[PDB]
């Protein structure tokens, strides 16, 4: 759903 390097916040 996102792109690579993002993380839940």
Same mark, same amino acid.
Do not use: T, Y
């Given at each position: 759903?996102? /792109? /690579?390097?993002?993380? /839940?916040?």
């Amino acid at each position: 759903k996102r /792109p /690579p390097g993002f993380s /839940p916040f």
